[PDB]
């Protein structure tokens, strides 16, 4: 079983750090089996190709910036909806991710399952630090990545039960 939990985004842009902070909280609070890899991919594109390939379940956390919903809204997209979502002209790093997914489809190594847990940002200003409204969404987003993990048969153990 190969599973990757990919946090993507930019810590320097306020709420565009949400993906990276989600995956940092996971790693810090839960004990997971060795076949679950956790990676901070930042704003990288094609350099992630090898990490993303041959995954039974690929879970991505990121800020959703191409939808008109209220700041702080959480959206879960699965399978064919994630490439579609990433094919936009608002976020260049998402378009690079859409190119990586295409390359993987071309070589027959597209993830068997794909889940995106996304949160719509409040502010994208140059600054290190989430807004209060997005910061309150770390826990609920974290529960969603746990649920997606549990759906592939992995149970995460809180470190507090250790």
Swiss-Prot record:
It is an enzyme of class 3 (hydrolase). Gene3D superfamilies: HybD-like. Its EC number is 3.4.23.-. It comes from Escherichia coli (strain K12). Its cofactor is Ni(2+). Signal peptide: none annotated. GO terms for molecular function: aspartic-type endopeptidase activity; endopeptidase activity; enzyme activator activity; metal ion binding. This is Hydrogenase 2 maturation protease. Coiled coil: none annotated. InterPro entries: Pept_A31_hyd_express, Pept_HybD-like_dom_sf, Peptidase_A31. The lineage of its organism: Bacteria, Pseudomonadati, Pseudomonadota, Gammaproteobacteria, Enterobacterales. Ni(2+) binds at residues 16, 62, 93. SUPFAM superfamilies: HybD-like. Pfam families: HycI. Protease involved in the C-terminal processing of HybC, the large subunit of hydrogenase 2. Specifically cleaves off a 15 amino acid peptide from the C-terminus of the precursor of HybC.
